[PDB]
Amino acid sequence: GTVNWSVEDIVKGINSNNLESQLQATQAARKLLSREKQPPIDNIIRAGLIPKFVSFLGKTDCSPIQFESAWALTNIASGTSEQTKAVVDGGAIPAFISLLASPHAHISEQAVWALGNIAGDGSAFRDLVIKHGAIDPLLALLAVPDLSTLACGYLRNLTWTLSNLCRNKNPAPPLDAVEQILPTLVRLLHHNDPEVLADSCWAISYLTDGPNERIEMVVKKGVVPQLVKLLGATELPIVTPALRAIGNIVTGTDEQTQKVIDAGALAVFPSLLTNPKTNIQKEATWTMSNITAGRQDQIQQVVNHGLVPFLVGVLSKADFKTQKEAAWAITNYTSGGTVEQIVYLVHCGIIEPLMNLLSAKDTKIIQVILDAISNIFQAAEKLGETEKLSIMIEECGGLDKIEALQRHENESVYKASLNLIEKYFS
């Protein structure tokens, strides 16, 4: 009945003083914007229809047109920053926040969706949505004894919009807004719907990506155990954001990293460091490198869980980015480790693959490799076995690579390998 309309027909129907004709035209616009292939968002905007849709959003006496205009504006705001700005410039934020309290669930859900798109555009529109007072009604929509009594899609959209209100930095969300939202995210993180869990983990990972104050805000709520549980989840959409959140948390202070360790996260890394998804392996190796840069008791915890062999394996065979994260982990290990710990690491067979990566064509990883070599040689000098490690590095064919790098473009690697060759092979 309203399929394949022309923008001219839509404008003619909207410009009529007939509420029913206006509703038909708005429905037609919604349907036209609900096609996967090239929605004419720019044509609709140029026709000046956004103000009309925003005005329709407030016709409480005609909820059908409210829903249709909400859908159309949602689809428009889901496009480029220019189109989202066009939607916002029509005053749609206050209208959607008002409709959040609609008696019709399918209209409040559309308001949630539209506000989520607007907030997800960026930190500016996010802070503007927060300034119009959306957090209060959004969270009120979730004030129920049991979250399972709400519609699945409704809860999923609410969680996604909250995550968008939590995401983006420069600047990060308002601290008081994060304090207001965090309890509901904890509740949602203990929910059972996989998509809601993924969105909640993504929100937490957003909040944990920043200064240690935010990490502390998140950790004080005691969600780290649940984050580790979800880290052990079976669904990759849930494991990925949980691992990102754990990594963000361990980038903070040693005390927050210790809180993470106490939750048992390391016990899950045997499989994460061998996970089939290369992104998961890279993220897990990055987390392990950030963990090995901490205190010595934490390095000993890493050792006890048997993860040094897994780091050796990742350094021996894995995507180059995962291998770089592993090189960083090994360098941090050797920089902060105990002489006994460096000895154990070498005994696990790290020297051969660590020299194997010396043939890499990335200056930074070569610098990291040589910095770790310096640390290990210092440990050997302390223990009095420098000649042993010299013979080792020379037997696996690595000192050939160090002699080669002696004439390297970068000056840092140049000086490092030169110092090594001169102080250990002369």
């Binding site: 349907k31 914007l33 609900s34 096609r35 996967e36 929605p39 859908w71 949602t74 689809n75 705001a77 889901s78 496009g79 989202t84 559309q110 969706w113 989520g116 798109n117 997800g120 555009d121 996604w160 995550s163 968008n164 995401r167 993924a198 969105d199 993504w202 990506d209 954001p241 361990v250 980038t251 903070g252 990055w286 490198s289 950030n290 840069a293 901490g294 960083w328 941090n332 920089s335 902060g336």
Partner: peptide
């Protein structure tokens, strides 16, 4: 010993 440092941002309701 030095520490270092995606889902849809927008969604259209499609039929």
């Amino acid at each position: 010993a030095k520490k270092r440092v995606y889902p849809k941002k927008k969604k259209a309701r499609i039929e």
